[PDB]
Design a protein around this ligand. Structure first.
Ligand SMILES: *[C@H]1O[C@H](CO[C@H]2O[C@@H](C)[C@@H](O)[C@@H](O)[C@@H]2O)[C@@H](O[C@H]2O[C@H](CO)[C@@H](O)[C@H](O)[C@H]2NC(C)=O)[C@H](O)[C@H]1NC(C)=O
Length: 400
């Protein structure tokens, strides 16, 4: 929900004197944004899903091909009408059988025949739609306020500290104004627009493995089917019945169910994880405008920390041209600003390393508190320093 530690991170400084910034978020990526005299924040897209879906069709693979019927009609006696023709209880089909004396009929020749088999469904290869209106985005915003190696990744702690949030964006309401306590608030206006595949594709569901198929390959396929009712049409797939029998019994062999027909057209349609009501879309992006003239600093009326500061370990390389590290404050005094900067050479007057964790400070008054810090040092060798004079400590670093 925040950027630290992610490989898909991008640092931004909107514009000069800008209270807003235009941005682009995508799947597994994050973005850290900096702005003069204001907290740093991380905008990050968490999830992409198609919610509130609706079914469209339902092809079956089937069972019930058990009950039989064979309404017999003697030659010249006309056609045969099976009572099992009043209700879709069964599927009927007429035929004719060569007969006569040999089998109870008076004349010789073709006699009518109208048998019927039953139909209900077993495994429904269900499928649904994705209204562009069903697309909802989940953006998470973090605030680079006080943290520790520990609490930095705990969403809970952070929310509690009002230094994080997770809201959703929809075509309905593409914006939001996330309030962050005394830090004011950030208001994004993400524009659902994105470079992705049009809703044109259907939502194919097969047993467990969900897939995304082409409207037509799907709709224009050959298998029994049913929209939103218990009523099924084209059940003709109850085939291979017409052994072209006798009036006694017309073998109604249940058509062998060969999942190959489906499977075979696997690769074509893209696979997708789908929970009863959700469809996580993987490909997609979002253009946002992080307006933040309402984002504001905090603890700016406090004094500078004046007590020893100790490193808790070799700073680490984020792989982004910045490093992380955690301090510990011997200080007994309360919430004070942390005097840390990046100096080009011991005891220089002017800094050179910009802090990602701008305006850092010991959150509590409980001595020996920890402070996490991410900063970008200059290239080549440099020194990180905390405190000043004879309290001041330091640790060297060399960027490449
Ligand atoms: C963040 O959320 C929970 C907060 O507990 C922490 O609170 C801070 C202020 C500090 O005092 C920490 O020392 C303390 O642990 C914790 O998460 C809880 O739920 C997790 C569920 O997987 C579980 O792993 C964890 O043990 C449990 N801790 C508690 C409240 O007893 C945890 O600190 C951290 N959550 C995680 C694990 O990321």
């Amino acid at each position: 929900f925040n950027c630290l530690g992610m490989s898909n991170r991008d640092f931004l400084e909107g514009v000069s004197g800008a209270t807003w910034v235009d941005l682009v978020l995508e799947g597994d990526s994050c973005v850290t944004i900096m702005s003069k005299d204001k907290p740093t924040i991380d905008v990050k897209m968490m999830n992409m899903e198609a919610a509130n879906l609706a079914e469209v069709r339902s092809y079956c693979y089937l069972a019930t091909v058990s009950d039989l019927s064979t309404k017999a009609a003697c030659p010249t006696m006309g056609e045969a009408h099976n009572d099992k023709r009043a209700d879709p209880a069964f599927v009927c089909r007429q035929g004719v059988v060569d007969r006569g004396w040999g089998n109870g009929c008076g004349l010789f020749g073709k006699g009518s025949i109208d048998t019927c088999a039953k139909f209900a469904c077993s495994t429904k290869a269900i499928g649904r739609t994705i209204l562009k209106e069903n697309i909802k985005y989940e953006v998470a915003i973090f605030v680079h306020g006080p943290t520790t190696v520990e609490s930095h990744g705990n969403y809970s702690t952070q929310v509690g500290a009002t230094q994080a949030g997770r809201f959703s964006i929809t075509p309905a309401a593409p914006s939001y104004t996330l309030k962050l306590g005394e830090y004011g608030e950030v208001t994004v206006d993400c524009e659902p627009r994105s470079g992705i595949d049009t809703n044109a594709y259907y939502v194919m569901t097969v047993g467990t493995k969900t897939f995304l198929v082409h409207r037509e390959w799907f709709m224009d396929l050959n298998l029994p089917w049913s929209s939103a009712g218990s009523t099924v049409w084209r059940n003709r797939e109850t085939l291979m019945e017409f052994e072209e029998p006798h009036a006694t019994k017309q073998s109604v062999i249940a058509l062998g169910s060969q999942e190959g027909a489906l499977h075979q057209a696997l690769a074509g349609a893209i696979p997708v994880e789908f929970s009863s009501n959700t469809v996580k879309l993987t490909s997609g992006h979002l253009k946002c405008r992080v307006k933040m003239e309402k984002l504001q600093l905090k603890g700016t009326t406090y004094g500078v920390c004046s007590k020893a500061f100790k490193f808790l370990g070799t700073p680490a390389d984020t792989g982004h041209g910045t490093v992380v590290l955690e301090l510990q404050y011997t200080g007994t005094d309360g919430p004070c600003k942390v005097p840390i900067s990046s100096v080009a050479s011991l005891n220089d007057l002017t800094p050179v390393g910009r802090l990602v964790t701008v305006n850092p400070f010991v959150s509590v008054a409980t001595a020996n508190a920890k402070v996490l810090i991410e900063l970008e040092p200059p290239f080549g060798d440099s020194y990180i320093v905390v405190g000043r004079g004879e309290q001041q400590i330091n640790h060297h670093w060399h960027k490449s």
